[PDB]
mmCIF file of C-alpha atoms in Angstrom:
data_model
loop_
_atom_site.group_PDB
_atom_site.id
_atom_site.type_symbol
_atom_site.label_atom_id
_atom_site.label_comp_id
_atom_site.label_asym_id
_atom_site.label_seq_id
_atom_site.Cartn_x
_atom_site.Cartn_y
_atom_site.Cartn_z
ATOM 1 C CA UNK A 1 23.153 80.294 -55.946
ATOM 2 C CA UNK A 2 24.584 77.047 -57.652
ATOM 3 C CA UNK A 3 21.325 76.359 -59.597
ATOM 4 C CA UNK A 4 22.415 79.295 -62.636
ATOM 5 C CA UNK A 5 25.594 77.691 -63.506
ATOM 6 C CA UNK A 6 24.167 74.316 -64.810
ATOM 7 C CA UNK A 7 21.513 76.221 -67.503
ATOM 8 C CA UNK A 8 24.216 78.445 -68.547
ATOM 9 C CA UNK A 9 27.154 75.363 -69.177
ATOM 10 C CA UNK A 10 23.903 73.254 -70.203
ATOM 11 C CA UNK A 11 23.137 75.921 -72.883
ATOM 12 C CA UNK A 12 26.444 76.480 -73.425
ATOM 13 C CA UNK A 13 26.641 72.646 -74.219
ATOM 14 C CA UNK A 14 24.194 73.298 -76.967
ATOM 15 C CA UNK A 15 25.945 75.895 -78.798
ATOM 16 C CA UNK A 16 28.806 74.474 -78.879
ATOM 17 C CA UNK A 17 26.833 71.336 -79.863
ATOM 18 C CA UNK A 18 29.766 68.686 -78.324
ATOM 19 C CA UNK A 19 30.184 67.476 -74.807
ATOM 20 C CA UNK A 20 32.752 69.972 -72.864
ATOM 21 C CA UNK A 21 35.490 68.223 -70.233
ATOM 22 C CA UNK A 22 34.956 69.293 -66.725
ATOM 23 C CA UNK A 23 38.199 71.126 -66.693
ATOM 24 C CA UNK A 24 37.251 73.312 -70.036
ATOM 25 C CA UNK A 25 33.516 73.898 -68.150
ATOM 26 C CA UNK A 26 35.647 75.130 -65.394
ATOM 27 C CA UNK A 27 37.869 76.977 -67.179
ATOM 28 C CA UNK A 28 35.486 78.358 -69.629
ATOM 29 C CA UNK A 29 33.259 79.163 -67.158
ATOM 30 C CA UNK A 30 36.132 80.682 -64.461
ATOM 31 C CA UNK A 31 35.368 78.547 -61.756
ATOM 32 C CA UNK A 32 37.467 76.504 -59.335
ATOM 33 C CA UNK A 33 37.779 73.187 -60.116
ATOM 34 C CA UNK A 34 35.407 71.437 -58.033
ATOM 35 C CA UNK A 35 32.815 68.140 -57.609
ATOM 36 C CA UNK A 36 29.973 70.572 -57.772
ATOM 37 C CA UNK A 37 29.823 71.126 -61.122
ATOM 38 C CA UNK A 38 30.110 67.736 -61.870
ATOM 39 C CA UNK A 39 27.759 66.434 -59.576
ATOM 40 C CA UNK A 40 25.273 69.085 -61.198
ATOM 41 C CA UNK A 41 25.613 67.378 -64.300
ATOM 42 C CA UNK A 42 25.557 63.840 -62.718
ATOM 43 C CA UNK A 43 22.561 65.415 -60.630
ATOM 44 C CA UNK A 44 20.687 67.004 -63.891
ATOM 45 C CA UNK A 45 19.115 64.884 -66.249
ATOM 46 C CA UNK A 46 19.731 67.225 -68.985
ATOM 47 C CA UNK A 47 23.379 66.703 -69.119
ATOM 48 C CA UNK A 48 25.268 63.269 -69.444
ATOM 49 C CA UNK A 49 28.030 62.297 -67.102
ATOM 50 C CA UNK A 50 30.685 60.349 -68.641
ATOM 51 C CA UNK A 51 32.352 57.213 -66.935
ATOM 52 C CA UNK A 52 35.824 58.120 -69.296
ATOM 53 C CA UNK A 53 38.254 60.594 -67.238
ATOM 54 C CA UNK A 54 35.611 63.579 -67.809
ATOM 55 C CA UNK A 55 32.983 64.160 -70.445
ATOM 56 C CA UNK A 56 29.654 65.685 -70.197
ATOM 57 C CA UNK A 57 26.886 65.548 -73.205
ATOM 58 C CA UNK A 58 23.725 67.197 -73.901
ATOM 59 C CA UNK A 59 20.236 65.145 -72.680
ATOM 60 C CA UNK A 60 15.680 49.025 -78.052
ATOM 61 C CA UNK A 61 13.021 51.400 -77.210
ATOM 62 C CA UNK A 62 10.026 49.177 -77.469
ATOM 63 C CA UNK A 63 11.654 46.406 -75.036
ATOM 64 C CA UNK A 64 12.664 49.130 -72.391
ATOM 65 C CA UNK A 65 9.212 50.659 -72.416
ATOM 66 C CA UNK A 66 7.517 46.894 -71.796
ATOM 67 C CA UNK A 67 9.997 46.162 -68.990
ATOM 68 C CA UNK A 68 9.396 49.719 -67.084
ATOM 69 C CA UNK A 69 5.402 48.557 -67.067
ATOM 70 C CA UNK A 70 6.371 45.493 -66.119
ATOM 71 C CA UNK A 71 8.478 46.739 -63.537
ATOM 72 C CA UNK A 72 5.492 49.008 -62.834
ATOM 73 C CA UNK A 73 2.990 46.122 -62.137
ATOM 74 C CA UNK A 74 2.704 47.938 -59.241
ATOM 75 C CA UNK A 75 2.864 51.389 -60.433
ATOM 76 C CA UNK A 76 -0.608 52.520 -62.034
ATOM 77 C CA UNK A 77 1.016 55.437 -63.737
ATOM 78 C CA UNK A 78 3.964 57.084 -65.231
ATOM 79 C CA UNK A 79 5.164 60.369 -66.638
ATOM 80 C CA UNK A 80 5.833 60.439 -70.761
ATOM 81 C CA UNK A 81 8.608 63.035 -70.624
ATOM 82 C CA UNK A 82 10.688 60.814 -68.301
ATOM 83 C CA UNK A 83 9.628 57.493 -70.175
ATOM 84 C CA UNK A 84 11.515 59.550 -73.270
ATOM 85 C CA UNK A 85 14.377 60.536 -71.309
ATOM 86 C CA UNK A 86 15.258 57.163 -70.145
ATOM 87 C CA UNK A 87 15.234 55.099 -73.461
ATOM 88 C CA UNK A 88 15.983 58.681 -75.872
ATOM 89 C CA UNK A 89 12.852 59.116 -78.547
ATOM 90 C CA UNK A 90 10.302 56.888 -76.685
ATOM 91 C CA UNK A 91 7.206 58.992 -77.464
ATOM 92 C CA UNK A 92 7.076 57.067 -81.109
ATOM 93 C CA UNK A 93 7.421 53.460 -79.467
ATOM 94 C CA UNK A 94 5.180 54.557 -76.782
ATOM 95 C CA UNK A 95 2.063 56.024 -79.493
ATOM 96 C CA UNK A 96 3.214 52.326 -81.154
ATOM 97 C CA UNK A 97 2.771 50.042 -78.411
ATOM 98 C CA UNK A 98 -0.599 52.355 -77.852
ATOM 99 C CA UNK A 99 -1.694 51.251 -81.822
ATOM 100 C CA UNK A 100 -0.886 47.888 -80.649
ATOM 101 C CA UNK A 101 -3.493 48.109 -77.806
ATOM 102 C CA UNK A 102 -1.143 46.367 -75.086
ATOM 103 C CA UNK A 103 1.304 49.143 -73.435
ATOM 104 C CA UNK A 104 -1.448 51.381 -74.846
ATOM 105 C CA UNK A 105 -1.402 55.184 -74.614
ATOM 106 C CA UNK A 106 -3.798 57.651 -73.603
ATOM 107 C CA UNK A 107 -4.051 61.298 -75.711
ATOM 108 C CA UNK A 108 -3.620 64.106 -74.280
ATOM 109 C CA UNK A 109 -6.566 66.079 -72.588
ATOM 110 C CA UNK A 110 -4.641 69.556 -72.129
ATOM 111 C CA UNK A 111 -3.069 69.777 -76.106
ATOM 112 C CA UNK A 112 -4.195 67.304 -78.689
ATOM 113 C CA UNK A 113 -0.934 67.131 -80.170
ATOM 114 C CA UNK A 114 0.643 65.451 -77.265
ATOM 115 C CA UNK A 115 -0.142 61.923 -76.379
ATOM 116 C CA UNK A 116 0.841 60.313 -72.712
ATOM 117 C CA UNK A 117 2.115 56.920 -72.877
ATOM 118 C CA UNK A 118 0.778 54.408 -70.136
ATOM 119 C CA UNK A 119 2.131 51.659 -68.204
ATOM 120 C CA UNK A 120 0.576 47.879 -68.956
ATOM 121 C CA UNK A 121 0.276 45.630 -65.850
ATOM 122 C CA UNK A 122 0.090 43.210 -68.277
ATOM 123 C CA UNK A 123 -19.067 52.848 -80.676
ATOM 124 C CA UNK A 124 -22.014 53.789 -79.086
ATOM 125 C CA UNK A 125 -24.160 51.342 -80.763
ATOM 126 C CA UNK A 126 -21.698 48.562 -79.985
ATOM 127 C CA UNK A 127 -21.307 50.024 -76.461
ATOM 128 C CA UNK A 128 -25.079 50.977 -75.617
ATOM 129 C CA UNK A 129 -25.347 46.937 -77.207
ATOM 130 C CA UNK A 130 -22.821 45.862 -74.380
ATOM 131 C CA UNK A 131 -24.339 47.952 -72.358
ATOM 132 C CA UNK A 132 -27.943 49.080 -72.690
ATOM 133 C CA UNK A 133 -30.342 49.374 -69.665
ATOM 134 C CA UNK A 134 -28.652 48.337 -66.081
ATOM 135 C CA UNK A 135 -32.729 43.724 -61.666
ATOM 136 C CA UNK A 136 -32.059 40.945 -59.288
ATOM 137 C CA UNK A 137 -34.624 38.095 -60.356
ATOM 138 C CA UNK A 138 -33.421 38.216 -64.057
ATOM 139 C CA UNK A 139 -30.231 38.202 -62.890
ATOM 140 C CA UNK A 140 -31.698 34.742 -61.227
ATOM 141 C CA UNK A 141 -33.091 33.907 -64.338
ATOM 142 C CA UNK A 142 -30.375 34.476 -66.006
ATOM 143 C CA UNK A 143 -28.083 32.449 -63.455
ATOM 144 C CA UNK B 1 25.367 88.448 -61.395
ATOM 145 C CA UNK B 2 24.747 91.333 -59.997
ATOM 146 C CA UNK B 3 21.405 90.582 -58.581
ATOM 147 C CA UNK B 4 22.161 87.908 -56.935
ATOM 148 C CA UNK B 5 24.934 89.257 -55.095
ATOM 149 C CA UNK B 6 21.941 91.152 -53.640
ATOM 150 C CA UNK B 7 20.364 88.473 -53.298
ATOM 151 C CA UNK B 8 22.755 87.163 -50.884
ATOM 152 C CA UNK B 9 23.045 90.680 -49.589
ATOM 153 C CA UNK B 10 18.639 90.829 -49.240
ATOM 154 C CA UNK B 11 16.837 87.293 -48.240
ATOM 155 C CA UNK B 12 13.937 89.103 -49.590
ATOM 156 C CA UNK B 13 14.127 92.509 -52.368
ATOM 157 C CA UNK B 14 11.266 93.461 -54.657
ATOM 158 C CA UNK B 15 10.824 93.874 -58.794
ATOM 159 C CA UNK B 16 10.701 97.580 -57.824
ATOM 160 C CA UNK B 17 14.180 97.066 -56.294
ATOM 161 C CA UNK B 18 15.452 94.846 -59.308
ATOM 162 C CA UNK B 19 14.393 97.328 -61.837
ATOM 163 C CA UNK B 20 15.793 100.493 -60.053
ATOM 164 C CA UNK B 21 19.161 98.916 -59.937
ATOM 165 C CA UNK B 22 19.046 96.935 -63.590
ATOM 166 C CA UNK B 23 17.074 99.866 -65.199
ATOM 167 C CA UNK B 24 15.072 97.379 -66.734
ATOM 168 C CA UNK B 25 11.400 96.063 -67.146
ATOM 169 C CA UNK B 26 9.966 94.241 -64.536
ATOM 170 C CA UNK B 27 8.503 91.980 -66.433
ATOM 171 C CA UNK B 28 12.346 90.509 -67.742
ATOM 172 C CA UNK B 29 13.559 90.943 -63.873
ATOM 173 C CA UNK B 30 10.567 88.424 -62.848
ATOM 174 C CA UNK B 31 11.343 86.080 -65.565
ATOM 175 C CA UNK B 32 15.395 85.229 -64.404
ATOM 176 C CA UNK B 33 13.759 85.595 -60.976
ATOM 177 C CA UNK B 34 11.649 82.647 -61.257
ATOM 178 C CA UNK B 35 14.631 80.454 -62.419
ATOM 179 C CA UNK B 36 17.190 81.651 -58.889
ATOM 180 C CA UNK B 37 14.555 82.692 -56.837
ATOM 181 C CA UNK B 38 10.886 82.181 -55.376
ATOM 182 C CA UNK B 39 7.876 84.600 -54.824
ATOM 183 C CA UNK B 40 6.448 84.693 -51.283
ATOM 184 C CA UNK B 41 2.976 85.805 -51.424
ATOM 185 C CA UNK B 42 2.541 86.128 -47.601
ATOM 186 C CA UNK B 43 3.668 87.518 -44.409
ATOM 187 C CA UNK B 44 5.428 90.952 -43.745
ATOM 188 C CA UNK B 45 7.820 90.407 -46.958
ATOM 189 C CA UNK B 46 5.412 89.073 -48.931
ATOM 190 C CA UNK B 47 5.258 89.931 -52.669
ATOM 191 C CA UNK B 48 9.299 89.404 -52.805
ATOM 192 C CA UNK B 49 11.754 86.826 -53.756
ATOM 193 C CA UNK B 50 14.102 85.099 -51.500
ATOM 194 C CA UNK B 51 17.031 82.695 -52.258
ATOM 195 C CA UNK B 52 16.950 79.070 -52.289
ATOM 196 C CA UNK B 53 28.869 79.486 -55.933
ATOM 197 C CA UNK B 54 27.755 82.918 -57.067
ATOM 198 C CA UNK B 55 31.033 83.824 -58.580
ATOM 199 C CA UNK B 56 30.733 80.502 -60.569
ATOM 200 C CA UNK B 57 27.160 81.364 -61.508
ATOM 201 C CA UNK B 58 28.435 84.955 -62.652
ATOM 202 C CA UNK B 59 31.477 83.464 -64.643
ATOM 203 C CA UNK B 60 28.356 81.609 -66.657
ATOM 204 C CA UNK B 61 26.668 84.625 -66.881
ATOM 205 C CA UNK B 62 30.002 85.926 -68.600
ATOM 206 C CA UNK B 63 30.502 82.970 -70.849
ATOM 207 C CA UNK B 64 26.351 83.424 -71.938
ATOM 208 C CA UNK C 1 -9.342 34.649 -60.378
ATOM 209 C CA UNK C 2 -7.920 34.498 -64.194
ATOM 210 C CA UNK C 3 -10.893 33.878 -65.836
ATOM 211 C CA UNK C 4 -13.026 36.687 -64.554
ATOM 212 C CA UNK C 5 -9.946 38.803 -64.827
ATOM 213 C CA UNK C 6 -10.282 38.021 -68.660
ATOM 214 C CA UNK C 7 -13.855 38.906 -68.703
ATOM 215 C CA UNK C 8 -13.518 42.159 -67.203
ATOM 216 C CA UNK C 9 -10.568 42.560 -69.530
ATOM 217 C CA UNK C 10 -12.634 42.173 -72.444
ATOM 218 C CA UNK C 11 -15.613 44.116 -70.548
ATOM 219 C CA UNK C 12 -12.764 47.138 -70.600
ATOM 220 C CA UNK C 13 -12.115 46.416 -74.602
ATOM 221 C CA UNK C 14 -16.413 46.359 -75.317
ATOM 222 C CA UNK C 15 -17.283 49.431 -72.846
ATOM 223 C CA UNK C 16 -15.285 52.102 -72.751
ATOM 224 C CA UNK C 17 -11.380 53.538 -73.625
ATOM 225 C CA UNK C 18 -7.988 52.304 -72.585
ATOM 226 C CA UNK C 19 -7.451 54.383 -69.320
ATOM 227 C CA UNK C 20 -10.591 52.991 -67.112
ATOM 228 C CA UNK C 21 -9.049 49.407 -68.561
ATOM 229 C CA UNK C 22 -5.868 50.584 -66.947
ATOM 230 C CA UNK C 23 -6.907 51.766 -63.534
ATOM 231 C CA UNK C 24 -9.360 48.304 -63.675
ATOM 232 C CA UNK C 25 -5.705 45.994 -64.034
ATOM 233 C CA UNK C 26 -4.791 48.634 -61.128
ATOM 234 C CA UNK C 27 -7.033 47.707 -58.964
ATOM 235 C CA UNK C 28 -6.362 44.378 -60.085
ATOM 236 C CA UNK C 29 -2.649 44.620 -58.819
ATOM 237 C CA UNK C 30 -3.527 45.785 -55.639
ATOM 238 C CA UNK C 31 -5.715 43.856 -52.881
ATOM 239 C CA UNK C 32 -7.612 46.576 -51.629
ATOM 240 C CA UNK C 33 -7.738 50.693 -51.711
ATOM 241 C CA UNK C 34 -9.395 53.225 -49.819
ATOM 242 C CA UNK C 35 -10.581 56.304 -51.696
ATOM 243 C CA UNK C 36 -6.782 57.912 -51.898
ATOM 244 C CA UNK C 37 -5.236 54.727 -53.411
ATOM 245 C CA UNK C 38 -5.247 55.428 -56.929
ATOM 246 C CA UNK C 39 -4.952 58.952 -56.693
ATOM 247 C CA UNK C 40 -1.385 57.850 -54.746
ATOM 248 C CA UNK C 41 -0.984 54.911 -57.969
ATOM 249 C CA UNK C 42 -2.183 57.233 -60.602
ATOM 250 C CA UNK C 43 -1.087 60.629 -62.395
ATOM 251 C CA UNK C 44 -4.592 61.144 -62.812
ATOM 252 C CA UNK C 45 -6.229 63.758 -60.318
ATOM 253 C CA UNK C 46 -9.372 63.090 -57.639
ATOM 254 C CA UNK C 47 -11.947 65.146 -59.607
ATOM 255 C CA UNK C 48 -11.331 63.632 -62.606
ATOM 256 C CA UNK C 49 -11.162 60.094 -60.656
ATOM 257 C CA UNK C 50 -14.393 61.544 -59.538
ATOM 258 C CA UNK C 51 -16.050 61.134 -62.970
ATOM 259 C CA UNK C 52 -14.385 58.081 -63.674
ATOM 260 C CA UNK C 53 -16.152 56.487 -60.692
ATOM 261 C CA UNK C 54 -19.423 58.105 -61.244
ATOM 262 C CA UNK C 55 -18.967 56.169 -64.642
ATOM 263 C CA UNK C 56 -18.245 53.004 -62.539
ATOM 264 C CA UNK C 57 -21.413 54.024 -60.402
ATOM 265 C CA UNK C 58 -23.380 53.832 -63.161
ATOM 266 C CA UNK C 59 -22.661 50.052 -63.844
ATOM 267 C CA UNK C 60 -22.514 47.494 -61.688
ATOM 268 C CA UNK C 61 -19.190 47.020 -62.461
ATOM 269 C CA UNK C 62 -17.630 47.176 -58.972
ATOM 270 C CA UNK C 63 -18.470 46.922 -54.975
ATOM 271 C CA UNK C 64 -17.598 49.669 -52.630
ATOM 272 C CA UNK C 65 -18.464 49.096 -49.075
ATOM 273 C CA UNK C 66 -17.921 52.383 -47.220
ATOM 274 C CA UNK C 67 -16.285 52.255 -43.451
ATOM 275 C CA UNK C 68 -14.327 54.855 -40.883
ATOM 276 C CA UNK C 69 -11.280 54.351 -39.476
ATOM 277 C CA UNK C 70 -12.610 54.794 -35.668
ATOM 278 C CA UNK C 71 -9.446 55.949 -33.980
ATOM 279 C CA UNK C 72 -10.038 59.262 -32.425
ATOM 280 C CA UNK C 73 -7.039 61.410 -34.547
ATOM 281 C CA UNK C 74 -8.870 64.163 -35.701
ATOM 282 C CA UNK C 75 -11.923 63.188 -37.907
ATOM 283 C CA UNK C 76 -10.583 59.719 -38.257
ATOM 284 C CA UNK C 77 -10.648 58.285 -41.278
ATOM 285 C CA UNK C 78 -13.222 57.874 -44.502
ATOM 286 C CA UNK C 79 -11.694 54.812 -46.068
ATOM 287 C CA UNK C 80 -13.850 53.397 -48.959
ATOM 288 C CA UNK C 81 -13.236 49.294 -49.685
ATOM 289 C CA UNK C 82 -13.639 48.875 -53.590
ATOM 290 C CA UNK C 83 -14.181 45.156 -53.739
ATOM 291 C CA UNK C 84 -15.188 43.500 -57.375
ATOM 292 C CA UNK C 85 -18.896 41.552 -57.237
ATOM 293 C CA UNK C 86 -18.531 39.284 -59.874
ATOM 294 C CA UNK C 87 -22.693 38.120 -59.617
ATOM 295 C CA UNK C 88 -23.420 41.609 -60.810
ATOM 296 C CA UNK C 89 -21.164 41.842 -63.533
ATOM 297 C CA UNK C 90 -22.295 38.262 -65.053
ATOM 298 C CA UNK C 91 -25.977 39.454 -64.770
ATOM 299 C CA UNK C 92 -25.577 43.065 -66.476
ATOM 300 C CA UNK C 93 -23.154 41.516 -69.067
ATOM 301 C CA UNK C 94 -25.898 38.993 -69.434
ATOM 302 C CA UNK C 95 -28.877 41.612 -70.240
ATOM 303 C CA UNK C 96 -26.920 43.852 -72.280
ATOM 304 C CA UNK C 97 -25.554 40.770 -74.915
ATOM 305 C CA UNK C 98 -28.945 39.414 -74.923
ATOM 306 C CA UNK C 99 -30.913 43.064 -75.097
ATOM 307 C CA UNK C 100 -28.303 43.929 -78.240
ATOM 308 C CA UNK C 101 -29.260 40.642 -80.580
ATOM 309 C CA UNK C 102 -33.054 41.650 -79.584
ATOM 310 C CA UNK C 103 -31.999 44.827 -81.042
ATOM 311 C CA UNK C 104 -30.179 43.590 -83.667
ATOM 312 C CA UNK C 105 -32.725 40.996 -84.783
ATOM 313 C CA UNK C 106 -35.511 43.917 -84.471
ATOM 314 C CA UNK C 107 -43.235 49.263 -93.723
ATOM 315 C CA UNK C 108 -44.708 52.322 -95.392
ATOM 316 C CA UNK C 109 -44.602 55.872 -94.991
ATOM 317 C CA UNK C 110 -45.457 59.054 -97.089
ATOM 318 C CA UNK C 111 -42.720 61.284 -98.581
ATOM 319 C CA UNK C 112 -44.925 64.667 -97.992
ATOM 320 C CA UNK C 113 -46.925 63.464 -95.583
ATOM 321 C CA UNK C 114 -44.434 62.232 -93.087
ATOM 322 C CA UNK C 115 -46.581 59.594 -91.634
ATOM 323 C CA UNK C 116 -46.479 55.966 -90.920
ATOM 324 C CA UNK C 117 -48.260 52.656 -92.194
ATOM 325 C CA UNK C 118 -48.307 48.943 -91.322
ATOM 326 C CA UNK C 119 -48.951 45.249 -92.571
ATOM 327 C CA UNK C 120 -53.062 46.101 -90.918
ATOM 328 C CA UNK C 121 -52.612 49.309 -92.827
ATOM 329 C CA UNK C 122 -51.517 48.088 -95.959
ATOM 330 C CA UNK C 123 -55.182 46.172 -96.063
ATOM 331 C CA UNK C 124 -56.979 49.674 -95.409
ATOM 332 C CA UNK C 125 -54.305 51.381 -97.829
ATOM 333 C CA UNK C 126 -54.978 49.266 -100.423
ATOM 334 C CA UNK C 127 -56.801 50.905 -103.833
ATOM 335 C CA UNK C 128 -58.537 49.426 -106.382
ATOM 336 C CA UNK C 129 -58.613 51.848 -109.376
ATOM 337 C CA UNK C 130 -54.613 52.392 -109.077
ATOM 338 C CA UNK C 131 -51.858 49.093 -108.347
ATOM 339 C CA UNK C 132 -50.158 51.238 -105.170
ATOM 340 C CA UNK C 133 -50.989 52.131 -101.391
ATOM 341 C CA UNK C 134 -52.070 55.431 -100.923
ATOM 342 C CA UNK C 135 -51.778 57.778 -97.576
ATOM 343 C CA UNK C 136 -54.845 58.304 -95.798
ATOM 344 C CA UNK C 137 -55.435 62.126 -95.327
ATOM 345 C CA UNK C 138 -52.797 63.419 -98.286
ATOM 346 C CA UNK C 139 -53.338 60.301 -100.495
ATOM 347 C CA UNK C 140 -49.673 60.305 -101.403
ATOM 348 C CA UNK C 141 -47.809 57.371 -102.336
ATOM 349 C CA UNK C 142 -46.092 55.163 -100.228
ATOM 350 C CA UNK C 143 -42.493 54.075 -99.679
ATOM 351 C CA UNK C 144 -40.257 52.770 -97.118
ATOM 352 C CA UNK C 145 -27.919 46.447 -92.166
ATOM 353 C CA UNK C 146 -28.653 43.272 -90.849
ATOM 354 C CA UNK C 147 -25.652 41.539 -91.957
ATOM 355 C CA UNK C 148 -23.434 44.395 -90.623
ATOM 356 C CA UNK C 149 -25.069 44.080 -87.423
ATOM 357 C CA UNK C 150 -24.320 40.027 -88.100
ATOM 358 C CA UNK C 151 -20.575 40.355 -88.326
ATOM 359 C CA UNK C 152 -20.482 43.210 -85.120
ATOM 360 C CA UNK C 153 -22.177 40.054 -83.916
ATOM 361 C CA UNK C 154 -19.248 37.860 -84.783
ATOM 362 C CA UNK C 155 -17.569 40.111 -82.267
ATOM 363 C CA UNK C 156 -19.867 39.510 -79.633
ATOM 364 C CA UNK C 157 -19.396 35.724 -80.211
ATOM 365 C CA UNK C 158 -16.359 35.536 -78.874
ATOM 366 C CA UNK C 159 -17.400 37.363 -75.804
ATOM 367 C CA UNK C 160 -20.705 34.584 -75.312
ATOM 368 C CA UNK C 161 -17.889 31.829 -75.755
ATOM 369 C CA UNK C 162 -16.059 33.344 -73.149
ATOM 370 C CA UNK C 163 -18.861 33.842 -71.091
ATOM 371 C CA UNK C 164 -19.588 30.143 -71.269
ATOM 372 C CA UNK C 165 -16.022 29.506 -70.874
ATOM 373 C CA UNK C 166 -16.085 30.993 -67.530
ATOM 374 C CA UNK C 167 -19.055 29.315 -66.270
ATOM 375 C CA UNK C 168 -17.883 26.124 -66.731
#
């Protein structure tokens, strides 16, 4: 049952709207002092572990987002939500580097609103015109 | 907090169960539920929630 | 293999949307899948892959060769080999550039009348007594792009450059 007590500090983190020392989690929330709780915050990705003594917080775009598809050259897709939580406020760069036509992104098919952004491994008339009708002797000809 | 003392008390315990002893809606017991525990769907204890520090978790409760 | 990768890049940009470019440079990373190898790469689900590759089906786009896995673990295995055919691709690209500037480089007609006339039908249409041409049946009168199409063209320049470009 050690899966409650990281929503309710987590929450608890955004009321109080600052990051909360391990010792006044513990204290505030009556527990022993213990690794636990910290390592539920160093294990959740909504909460921020902090290398000074203890601190734990609530949780250069563009580049980061071109050197996770880069680093995803062999990846042929991504999630957006975790694309945002590793470089905070990526959905904007993301839709940009979409506009751009290079990292582009893909809109969403469940809620129109939303847009997935899409790693790089980097009209009808003009389509049915590059494509029209679809054999082997014109091809020949055409060789 | 109290609930999931039961929980470690039951492996498996039923809305019915939940709402007897909290006195309230089933329909707010099954939404904590799905955050501590799961539904199993099948076998003799199927349509009830098992399990997957409690006074630590209750001490939250207290300070939410 | 950087040339034809270009092609089909700009293939991706004339045809269709972003994500079939995407899972083409995909493919492109990897040597070879079978069948469950982009499902594995991609977020996108088999159904849905399903009508991506119908799509791909219905160009000659791609190769797939279809072969089992013979060892005898269950119902072995349906491994399909999606392998590029570059002839095919240079042929349909061919027809479909060509069969758009016949299009591109490709009257009279009667307001109650609906019909339609011609050049050999401007002859018979012709009337002396009035200056006009006048519908057959009704005897109504008679009335009836290609520099947008030019400059669309302009786009499809580049492409026949690169076309060239690639073969030698």
């Amino acid at each position: 049952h050690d899966s409650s007590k990281l929503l309710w500090a987590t929450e608890y983190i955004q009321k109080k709207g600052k990051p909360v020392l391990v010792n006044e989690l513990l204290d505030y929330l009556s527990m022993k002092k213990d690794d636990k709780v910290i390592e539920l915050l160093k294990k959740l990705d909504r909460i921020e572990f902090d290398p000074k003594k203890g601190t734990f917080k609530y949780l250069h775009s563009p580049s980061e987002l071109l050197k996770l598809l880069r680093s995803q050259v062999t990846f042929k897709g991504i999630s957006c939500k975790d694309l945002k939580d590793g470089w905070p406020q990526c959905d904007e760069t993301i839709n940009q580097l979409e506009e751009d036509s290079k990292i582009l992104v893909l809109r969403t098919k469940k809620d129109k609103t939303p847009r997935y952004v899409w790693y790089n491994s980097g009209d009808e008339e003009f389509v049915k015109m590059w494509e029209n009708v679809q054999a082997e002797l014109p091809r020949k000809l055409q060789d | 907090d109290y609930l999931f003392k039961l929980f470690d008390e039951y492996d498996y315990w039923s809305l019915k169960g939940l709402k007897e002893r909290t006195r309230q809606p089933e329909a707010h017991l099954k939404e904590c539920l799905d955050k501590v525990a799961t539904l199993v769907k099948k076998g003799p204890y199927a349509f009830k929630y098992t399990l997957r520090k409690e006074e630590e978790r209750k001490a939250t409760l207290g300070e939410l | 293999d950087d040339i034809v990768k270009n092609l089909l890049k700009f293939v991706v940009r004339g045809f269709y949307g972003g994500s079939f470019v995407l899972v083409l440079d995909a493919i492109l990373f990897h040597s070879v899948l079978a069948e469950d190898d982009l499902k594995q790469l991609l977020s996108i689900n088999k159904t849905e892959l399903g009508p991506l590759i119908a799509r791909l089906r219905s160009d000659r786009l791609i190769s797939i060769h279809k072969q089992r896995e013979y060892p005898p673990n269950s119902k072995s295995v349906e491994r399909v080999y999606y392998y590029v055919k570059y002839p095919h691709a240079i042929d349909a690209i061919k027809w479909k550039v060509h069969q758009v500037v016949q299009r591109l480089k490709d009257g009279y007609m009667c307001p109650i009348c609906l019909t339609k006339y011609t050049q050999l039908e401007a002859v018979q249409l012709l009337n002396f007594d009035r200056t006009e041409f006048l519908c057959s049946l009704c005897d109504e009168p008679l009335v009836e792009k290609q520099d947008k199409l030019n400059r669309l063209m302009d786009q499809i320049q580049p492409i026949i450059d690169s076309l060239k470009k690639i073969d030698d």
